Amino acid sequence: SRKKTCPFYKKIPGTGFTVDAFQYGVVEGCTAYFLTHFHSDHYAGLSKHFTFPVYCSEITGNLLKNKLHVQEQYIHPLPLDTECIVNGVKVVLLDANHCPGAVMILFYLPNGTVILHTGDFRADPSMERSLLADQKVHMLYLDTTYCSPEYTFPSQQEVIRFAINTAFEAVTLNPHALVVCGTYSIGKEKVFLAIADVLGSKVGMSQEKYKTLQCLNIPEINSLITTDMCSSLVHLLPMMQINFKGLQSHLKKCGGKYNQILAFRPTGADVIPQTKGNISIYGIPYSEHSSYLEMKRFVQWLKPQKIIPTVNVGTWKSRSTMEKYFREWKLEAGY
Ligand SMILES: [Zn+2]
């Protein structure tokens, strides 16, 4: 398999900087590799053999060190909201409101171009009150995961309220019911923690997952999570188990102590579960990405001059369609 070459949307023009570009070997000219967050599509390629500078948040740096064994000497964690000079360039990391340690990166280029790379983010009104507020941003590298008008979904808070009210009612109807959530990466902690909290329980999980959550600076985490599954009413399983076979199979462990499973999994408030026997799976629209409305609001507020989409950029047609939305957002706001 021939190593691929770093595409342009991961390069910061005229700098020696790349963002989330670890799977291409030595990128020619790259002197500093930024990692926006610890999701595998973004970190793919990093390992103990990576020997160029990696800039990232402190949570991401802990994860690089402890899970991927990146050598400490190449990990450069930067605090949020604070100007840092990197190979002569002024950079600022901001909270992306995505998963723990996820950042957006503000680059002040020598030539006066100001660039915002959102990494993955879920656009919030609070970003309109950050450092972004101060100077003009010319070029925006935008997380366009849900850059389509049909992508609507409630706030995280509405989804979590649905989830805790559902779980509560479920265990009131059956004290021997088990609540399950799936995971395959960091993020979405707020969902299983709010469930566990409403059930007065800790979240039961594997040794591996318990260690990962230690890297995340979640206040009093050890009081909320546990590896003793049999003591907990909320279990966290691999996403691949969240299906009737995996769940029927989990119900046979802990010695048949539980006789029903209620499971939550993200889609693909006001939802129909799939039910087979004593297993129910609710697909809930919990998202760590901007909805189409959230994205449009943020961009109309930021008023950038050029937008480089970084998701769903696999076809010309898709790239053009996004550009067309962006041009419509300009026409409508005026900028
Ligand atoms: Zn992500």
Curated annotation (Swiss-Prot):
Changing residue 143 to N: Impaired nuclear focus formation, reduced interaction with PIAS and increased sensitivity to cisplatin. Expressed in brain, heart, kidney, liver, pancreas, placenta and skeletal muscle. Induction: During mitosis. The mRNA encoding this protein contains an internal ribosome entry site (IRES) in its 5'-UTR. This 5'-UTR generally suppresses translation while specifically promoting expression during mitosis, when cap-dependent translation may be impaired. It is found in: Nucleus. Transmembrane segments: none annotated. May be required for DNA interstrand cross-link repair. Also required for checkpoint mediated cell cycle arrest in early prophase in response to mitotic spindle poisons. Possesses beta-lactamase activity, catalyzing the hydrolysis of penicillin G and nitrocefin. Exhibits no activity towards other beta-lactam antibiotic classes including cephalosporins (cefotaxime) and carbapenems (imipenem). Belongs to the DNA repair metallo-beta-lactamase (DRMBL) family. Binds constitutively to TP53BP1. Binds CDC27, which is itself a component of the anaphase promoting complex (APC). Binds PIAS1. This is DNA cross-link repair 1A protein. It comes from Homo sapiens (Human). The gene is DCLRE1A.
